[model samples]
Target: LSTWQTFRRLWPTIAPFKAGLIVAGVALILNAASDTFMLSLLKPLLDDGFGKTDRSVLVWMPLVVIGLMILRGITSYVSSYCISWVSGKVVMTMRRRLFGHMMGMPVSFFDKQSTGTLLSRITYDSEQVASSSSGALITVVREGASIIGLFIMMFYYSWQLSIILIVLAPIVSIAIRVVSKRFRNISKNMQNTMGQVTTSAEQMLKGHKEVLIFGGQEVETKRFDKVSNRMRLQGMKMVSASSISDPIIQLIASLALAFVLYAASFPSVMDSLTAGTITVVFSSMIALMRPLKSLTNVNAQFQRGMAACQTLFTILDSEQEKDEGKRVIERATGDVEFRNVTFTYPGRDVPALRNINLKIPAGKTVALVGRSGSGKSTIASLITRFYDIDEGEILMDGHDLREYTLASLRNQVALVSQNVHLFNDTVANNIAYARTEQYSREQIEEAARMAYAMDFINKMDNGLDTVIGENGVLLSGGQRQRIAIARALLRDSPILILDEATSALDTESERAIQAALDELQKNRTSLVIAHRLSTIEKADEIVVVEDGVIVERGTHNDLLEHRGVYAQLHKMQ
Candidate 1:
């Protein structure tokens, strides 16, 4: 949208603060009048009070000037406070609403967007919105009213001199329009480049361990400098345009001042206006310079907001996960079946899983073994309905997964993936996590003990309450995985999917964790995807997947006896 159109649309977020807006409007009007009052009284002060020099005139003029100064101060304070309050409230509301919108988006949306870029949009973009929406409005209404008041005073003093204003106003406005367009275009580029810079910095900062270990300092620094320097170059383009615009506007103002001065030399002008009256007219016209400049710059400031709002709006407008099922399941028996399932990722040319079929009985543990990119994890993802299948259906308890509401469906399943994500929070907090009220401390402890995490957790000073750093960075790989397992175990869901959950641990740790995993799967339907063939020897059934297709299926011994894919994979292990 055009800047003016964008500005008009932005007003709705602040629409709830009508009382404050009205107060600001009244304050602005009073401020403008009070400020121009002293200037407006110049004609009377000079022509009547000073030219005549009566004693009473001098006293009254001084008192009037003092009153206007006090009035200006009071109104200025009110206008500034009210505008600030309204603007802050508006920007905060947008920030809150934008975050809420993000929570409702699909996994696919996040797959395409980097966390750093999104963070920049929320933090950096919102500040620009504050400046554009509120700062622009303040300049437009506050400075704009001041300009209008001066014009009224100037026109009242001499309409003949105001004719020069009539001719000059359009020329200055056209110049401002053209300059603002360039500023706004540069502003958009600056916003985009800043996102890239933020993304680059976030990558290097988060992966500092990897960067240092691999001796990637020079490469990473050069990478960050590229984006940062590009951002600086874009910013300078805006600054250069602003610098050139000021002098051009000032020159136009000078031209109009010269034209009026030359016109005043005419005998007809001299007859209609006194010397004091001419002085008042010229002062009022000259006073327009500051406010005029501020008003013109508003578009460039507002354009920054427009670009940010557009970025946020596009994300918000994208498709969210469809949760339209009529059933609200309290729980399921955990009988899962994938019938002729075929699926492809959003931008993939080939299917991730093709013509896959599986029948997982209630309370039965099914293990899937495969090479990398062989659709083992894809089956786990399908079971959770992270992405809709391109063909066939996933059924839980003999009912299609889509027949149940997403919340209810997901509530029945607990997942612990290869990459366990722990928040920057206390151990108990992360283990209990979002459903804090649902699980007690005793239950949390029991779950931690079940996952074999409590042995090390008890060794810590704070036990369960120790605050782990971001993504459990304070914890070892085994410790992080144990916490993740504890979190999933605490959920007490009927269905569990362990996606290579114990892959990173050493020999003793893996065997202990495997025993814990076996106990956790008791009386619960489980889907376990593992690379180590030793882990799934006792699974009720084992399926071998290769190239997005399930090629072999049987007991571990039965598959080994067949001397096929599963037998070959077991030999490699």
Candidate 2:
């Protein structure tokens, strides 16, 4: 796409910091003016000051040179600071926006998007943008002003030579455009390759246990080797693009200057030229070449940044989860109803859940028993509105689930899943989680005790304050499970969805947690998804699901008497 199109996508991000841009621009202009003034001084000092050397010229010219240097120094400092400050702010703003938007995105978004890609966009892409925002942007402005000043000086001394130089400049512009497109295209590809490299490395490192035990060393090495090679290739393309363009443009400028030198050697041209005037014009023309070459190279960097911005803006401007519901509720009554409901996952033809009707009364427990991928977890996902249903309605209390604000709806339900994720933090902090300010220290510790976690927690060096490693890897499967149980218990939400919560625990640990679950489920509505028959034997009702349909549902005894799916499951286990 055109550069303007890419830049338009970035305009919103840059708009807020217009003041900083203006400050940098003003400083760049001042800096360029100082440089031009110093170049112009060469002629006056050589011709007028040094040519005659009046005693006053020695003192005055030195002071003038020193004064110009001081002005250049101040402008250079201001320009550098302002550009760096603004560039950093823009990147910070982009990161914050990217992260915040991802947090609000639909849960399904993560199921399809790459974790490594998102991370690269946040870190690597933002760094690429700095090339344009701070360095290239400053070079563009500063060098642009310098070129203009140099051109004016060139034309002033010799308009004929200036016209010839101007005619050759468009060749550099054409070359820049071609090289820039190369940078943009390869930079885009480089981002993807880098993402693959990052993802492969992340998985291998984190799963080093599996890698070692499974004798996967050579396999993973080869896998990483391929991705890293792709990264290297794409990276080399950018370097090649940058390195080639500068010298090619420099060659073009040299050719143009060669003809100018030839023209000045003629008697007609030589008669018109004084040594000092010739020096000023030649210096001005040569000065123009550096900015021209710099601009061409900066164009390449500018395009890389633009390509990154394009990727970033696509995410920033993309749709977020629909949270338009106006209804607000402090707490739900723990009654959930599903009516004529059907659901389908994105990019799949088959429905994950077929037409079904079910009503769960307030303050009651229901157990769902089904094989893997039988819509058991899909039902739980629907309740949380992780994915909107395709057919009918799901209601919390008397209101449709979508009618309540997302935060309020989620706030009413607590979940403890088979795959428990614990942050690397203190034991108490993990239990407290998000509502740390809301839950008291006493309440958190109390929940830990109820989950039978206090037994192991008390033996730890720091008890509740003990720092758990990533996902609590320092703890055993049973201990981690207890910590997850404690976290859910601490929520004390009206509704709890326990998806094989105690699956990780040993028999003794299970019995210990069973008492905590009994107490927590007493007055709260619970949806228990379990494979173990014994855990859900006392559930108020049992629902049998198979192949996305509810085949048979009854109380445990009633289902056993019916000799249906639940009974078959019980017999098998």
Candidate 3:
């Protein structure tokens, strides 16, 4: 997008802080006015106050200059504070909006995104966009005002010199245009590289143990060096662009200064100009260079910020998970059915699940057994409406899954999967992660007890209140799984899905938890996806899936008698 288009998109986010912006703008103008007024005093001081000055001229001149300095300081402070306050608010608002929007995005959106890139967008890109909103604006307004004021002072002394300087403006703008275009492209590459750097580092840290055990330190280091070096090169390219532009612009300004001096040296020009007028005009011309340089430098910052804003806006404008269902439900009856369902993942051509039909009556346990990537887990995901089916329908409690509000539909289900995600919070809070206020301490303890986690909880430093490290890093695999199961137990939803939920536990822990799970599944529709056939032997029905299709389904005795896929799987186990 063009920088102007990006700014137009950013307007709504910045609009609420217009009052702060206005105050800052006014202060900046006053600051520039004071500076110009100080320079204006030089002409009068040299003409009237230096030699044949009346006592009043000398006495009042120092006091007036000092007063102007004081006003400049105040104005500078006000402008800086106001702009900073506005920028801080802008950053906060953008970060919050990005986070809130990401929360509602579809599972497919996250599936295609890296955690590091998403993290950078929230923490880094948001700040860059905010800087563009206020920091670049401050430089443009303050330096722009200074340039205008200084030009007016020069015009008052001699319009000829001022016009000479104005003639060179187009040349400087052309240089800035080329430099800023490079800045924008480089800035975009830098942002992407930063995401890659973050991703590389994050992967390394997350797998630090694996790296050590596999002796992959050298390999990981080289991998990280590749991305890190790329980032450094991009940064250096930015610096080179900025450094080159500054000198070229400065050279143009020097040329203008040289022309002005040459013009002033002419007999007619010198005859018309007084010492005081010459001093004021030359000083004003030189003073103009500072703000012009600042304005050029701000172009780099402005372009980078615009690029960051474009990245952020793309995510914000993406289509969120569709929630067109107006129907709401207090609870579901736990019956789930798939009717001629077929689904493919977002980027793949082959269907993950083929046309299939299945039904689980309320208060029945159905076990799905399958080899890896055989669509067993896809069925569970579809029942929760994580991904919509491409054909046919999935129904829960006699209503189409998409016909109910997502929240109401999800509220009826509880899931405990192989990869359990636990927050870095107290044990009790993790167990009652959802609707914390609704679960009492006694209830939470009871759920822990049922999941067989209370034994470890009671032995912890603070029992139920002990804080688990990030993702339960401090806990053993079995302990973390138990905590997750406890969380699912506390949810007490009408439907339960256990997808390799007991895979992390030892044989003893698995047997103990299996008994509790059997009890928990009594009055709910439960879908158990397990590779271990023993865990699901007592299920009401066992369905064996292969290559996205269900090949066999029957009771343990019935399947064994039939000598089909389930019998083969059961015999192997």
Candidate 4:
């Protein structure tokens, strides 16, 4: 569907604020009507507008007009405030849901898009929607009503003049239509360039060290210049589109006034025209004509808004991750088994993970080992139901995982990955993110203790309340990895995943962290994916994966004694 159609669907966000919007609408209509009414009285007062030539007829009319002027200003003030309040509220409503949905989206959604582009859409686009829908919509409604109201009064004053206006207006509209088409094409190009520029800036700044080391300065500058040039050219094209409409309006306005003056040469045409009546008709027509001009100018804003809405709507309307099987699985019993599991990613000819069978009785640490692309991570991801398996059944407590609701089934698993994500908030809050307020202060600290995070955390300025920098930038790689473990510890779920948690740590840091991990793994079912052979030495069983298939599995020593694939990998590492 088109962007305009998406806007129609989005209107319901403001539905609850309808009463405030209605009041604003009413006030705006009145304000518009009064401005036209005051101008309509201008003709009567033109002969009387200024007392340069004193006349008794002009008496009291001046004061009454000033009073209406004051009233119109007051109404306009109240309506603008009201509309802003309603619009602000509507934007808030839309913001909360869109942001929440983005957070809950599958990790794949984030993998496919640039972070800078996502930020631009969420921040810049929502703001544009708020300003355009509220401010522009009100202007259109009030000014439009006023223009129509002025046109009818002008017609009443002289049907011949009104007939002439109706004919000229259509020609102006046809010209604007041509400009609007050009505006739309240019506007789209500008937005695409703008989104790309934002993404490029984000990447460049975040990778400044890498960029400088690699001598990418020239390429980065060239890329930015290219994007900026596109934006500038498109912006100029829109400016040209705007300039075309001004002449059309000026020519039409001049012609209408000229014709009105010529017609007045005939007394019959000016018949029943009191000095007051003629002034009012001319004033009303002038007032009406400007809004007609404004309605024309808003064409560009509409095009820009339409461009933004299309991208936003495409994501919002797409088929989201599936939610099948209404049943809810209660807390898992730590029993997990994979039977004949085979999986292939979208658009792939060969499987990323092939037929495999594995089991870990109630509580055990089973390490998965192999080189890159061995499908080690894929197995852990499936166990957590991040991706569903094909031609297989994963049983929790000997029941099919699909028999349980996705939320319930997934809730029992926790993750500790190499690259940890930390909110730029308090250390306590970072640890508690997965559990929220479900844990007590002692519980939080204890979990940190178990993950060996409490030592470094306590030494920080604010201890538990100390702020972790964005993505834990202030911490060393090993420290941040421990915080990730602390997060999983706080979750206290039956099943845990440690995805290459110690892959890049120094020997000393790895030993300190691995000791913490050994404690964390006690009596809890864990699936550990590790590249370093020694990390899996203590596992109850180790599974060797090679090219999406499980090649060997046994206790660490048992696999080594077999002199198979696991034995070869152990010697190589």
Candidate 5:
């Protein structure tokens, strides 16, 4: 992008602090001017003041030089402090916004994106911005201010010297412009290499146990070393770009200094320019080149920051999770109706659930039975508002389920899905997950008893205080499922969803959990999706789903009496 485009992107971050920025700019200019004056004083003292016979002149000249030194130092200190403060705060505000925006995105959005890439954005990209910003801003203030102030002073000294020096600056600037793209490109590569390193690190961390078991330590080591090597190469490229920028700016600065010196010493200009004047002019001329040097290298800094901004903005601009209605849905009666609820996931040709109609009255336990690819779980997913229906409406309590606020609607329901994700916390905490604040220790233990989780909880050290390893990997699948049920028991909502919560257990564990579940479901409205047919044989109602559409419905005996799909599924199981 052109410099103007960069200015456009940068304007908003700066616009808010325009007054402070202006103050910083003026301070920089004043500081540079003071420096120029100090340098100019050197020549006058050396050529004119040194030859004075008066003792007072000798004492006073040294004092003047010392005082200018102090003033220049003070100016440098104030300008640097102010500008750095502004840059730091600007970046902090940007980072805060970026974090908040990311959190606002839907769970599905996070599922599709990489953890590594997002972390890279937060750490590597943000750091790249921070480092570049402070240095780049100072260059703009200190060096840029010096360049302008010195240019004006140079013209005042001698147009001959100024014109000759200024002639070389554009050539140098053009060279910097040519090299800037390469600098930015290298910085981008360096950032990508860092990203790769982070990705590998995440994989290794997540798979550390496998690495130990498979004798794959050497392979992992080699892979990490390779990423490190790539990072090293990118770092070298950045250094090369910087090294190139350094000489071009210095070379041009040297040429200008040469011209100034030559003109001051030459007979042609000696009449107009004194040795003291030449010294003052040279100081100003050099100061102008300081900004040029900064101008050259700052290309790389701005590019990195702007590139990060482009990506940061993309995430910030994402739309929130879509909902069916802006209005709040009410607490549903257990009497649920799917008028024609059909849904498809994004980018899928096949529907997860097809056109379907079904109904069940309040307080009935409806068991949906189907094979692996069937729409049983998807039916539960839709009814729970995981995703909105792509086709039709579902009603509960004779009111549209979409009419309730998600929080209020969900507050009256609890889900025990196939995969029970137990958090890394005490058994009490895990079982207490749904209602820790609402329930006391006595209440959580009672819920655990209702879910049969207390059977295993008492076996562990510290019982409810025992820590479950990450994802509850330390617990058996049946134990985890029971814990999940306990969590749902803590929810104590009117409607309960059990989506194959017993499918993966040993027969003994399933029987034990089945009894607990039987007690837990007493008078609670339930929708149970099951592959294991035994758990649902006594359900108040039965439904059979196939290929995203329901084909049969009845009570267990009623379906057997009809000898239809529900009966056939039971026969197959």
Candidate 6:
């Protein structure tokens, strides 16, 4: 979007702070007026008070100067405080909105975006937008007022000299236009580079152990240096543009001053102007440079902010996960069926699951055995509606999955997958995570005990209250899986999906977990996706999938007797 377009979009965020902005703007104008008033005093001081016998001028001048300075200080403080308050609040509001919006985004959105880029948007981009709203506005109003006030002072002294400065305005604007465009382009590039640097650093730090064990420190450092160097180059480009533009603008303004001085030296001009008039006009012209410089410099900040705004607005405008269903269920009977279902992941041509039909009756165990990437886990994901099917219907409890609200649909299911994600919280909190019903201490402990997590929890320093590091970094893989299983157990949904849930466990732990899972599946509709043949041997029915097609369906004995794909997979294991 163009800068004006982005500003228009940002208007709603800034509109609520209009009262503060007005107060700040008035204070800024007063401050600028005081500065021009101070310069106005130089005329009376140099022309009348220094030598004339008018003692009144001398008596009142210092008092007025003192009062104006005091007034200037007060206005400056009020303006600064108000703008800061508004900007800080704007940043907080934008951040809260951005984070909340991200929470409702579709899974496919996350599949395409990196963690660091999203983090940068929430942290860096939001700050830029806030700064642009208040910081740029402050500079534009304060310095712009100062420039106008100084011009008026100059015109009062000598309109002839003021005309010269006025002529320089268009030239200065042209320079600003060129420099602002460059600043905006560079700022956009810098933002992307910053995201890359963040991504590289986050990845390297997250895999620090692997980098060390695999002797990849040199390679990782070089990789990081590449992105770091690009960031440095982008920053340097911004600095170079800013540095060159400032000097060029100052040079143009100085040339105007030089011309004004040269014109004032002519005999006719000298005949018309007094010492005080000449002094005030020249001083006013010289004073113009400071505010002028500030106005020009603020363009970089303003354009950067606009660019950041565009990035944030694009994400905010993207589509969220589709949850159009209005029906709510208190509890589902958990009879899930797929009818002629076909699904393809985003950005891929081949279908992940093609024309698949399946059924898991209420209160029965159905195991799905497959090789890696054979679409076993895709079926579980469909049950949760992470990604909707491209064709055909998936029904739960005799209603289309889309007929139920996403919350109610997910509420009917509990999942324990191989990739267990834990928060940096206590074991009890992690086990009780996201459960709508408040679980009692005994209930949480019972769930953990059944998952075999109590063995490790009792060995911890603070037991259930101990805080785990990020993603349970302090826990072993098996411990993390058990905690996840404990979480699923606490959920106690009507439908249970165990997708390689015990893959991380040792043989003893696996056997113990298998026993617990066997019992848990007795009364619930269970869909077990596993590579381990031993785990699914007792399942009521087993379906073997290969290349997105079900090649065999039978009991273990029946499949073994048929000597098909399942038999080959079982014999191989």
Model 6, span 1-573: residue lDDT tens: 388788887789878988888899999999988989999999888788887788888899878999999999999999999888888878888888888888977788778988988798798878778877677888899899888888777877777656765677677668767866776776667565555456666676798778888898788879888878876886787677656756665676677567767877777466557778878876886678888788998988888888878888888878888888999986677578888998999888988888877888888788998877889888888888999889999988778978889998888888876677778788888888765269988999999888777887988989988999764547776677678778888878888888775344688777666666666534688888876766678688888877777888878999999999788778788
Model 1 global lDDT (CA atoms, 0 to 1): 0.78
> lDDT by residue for model 1 over 1-573, one digit each (tens)?
465565567677777997887998898888877888888888877777767647676778878988898888888798889878887787788789888877867677678888998898887877776766767677788787788788777777778867766677787678777867776676667556555456666666898789889999898879888877876786787678657756766776687568767877787566668877877876887677888788889878778777777766666567777888888777587578888988998888898888988888888788888878878777877777788889998878778988888888788888876577778888889998889888899999999998988898878978889888764447777777778888888887888888775445788677656677767635588888875655678689888888888998989889888989777777777
Per-model TM-score on C-alpha atoms: 0.74, 0.71, 0.74, 0.72, 0.65, 0.74
Taken over the whole model, the C-alpha lDDT of each candidate is 0.78, 0.79, 0.80, 0.76, 0.72, 0.80
From the highest lDDT down, the ranking of the candidates is 6, 3, 2, 1, 4, 5
- The CA lDDT at 296 in model 5 is 88
Model 4 clash tally, residue pairs: 5
lDDT per residue as tens, model 2, 503-549? 44678877766676666534688888876766678789888877788
Better model by lDDT, 1 or 4? 1
How high is the lDDT of residue 291 in model 5? 67
lDDT measured at residue 260 in model 6 versus the true structure, 0 to 100: 64
Candidate 4 residue-wise lDDT, 292-313, digit = tens: 7788867667666766766676
Give per-residue lDDT, candidate 4, residue 535.
66
Model 5 segments beyond 4 Å from truth? 1-108, 111-135, 149-164, 167-268, 271-290, 296-311, 314-317, 322-331, 422-437, 455-476, 501-512, 521-523, 556-572
- Which tens-of-lDDT digit does each residue in 344-444 have in candidate 5? 87657789888888876678788878878777777777776867788888887667767766667777778876577767788777776745676789988
Judged by whole-model lDDT over C-alpha atoms, candidate 4 comes out at: 0.76
Model 3 stretches astray by more than 4 angstroms: 1-9, 41-74, 158-273, 293-311, 469-473, 501-512, 520-523
List candidate 6 stretches off by more than 4 Å.
1-5, 44-78, 158-273, 293-304, 459-462, 469-473, 501-512, 520-523
Model 1 weakest lDDT span, ten residues long? 190-199
Poorest 10 consecutive residues by lDDT, candidate 5: 322-331
TM-score of 3: 0.74
lDDT of 6 at 311: 80
Which residue pairs overlap in candidate 2's backbone?
Answer: none
User: In model 5, what is the error at residue 329, expressed in angstroms?
Assistant: 6.7
Q: Report backbone clashes per prediction.
A: 0, 0, 0, 5, 6, 0
The better candidate by lDDT, 2 or 3, is: 3
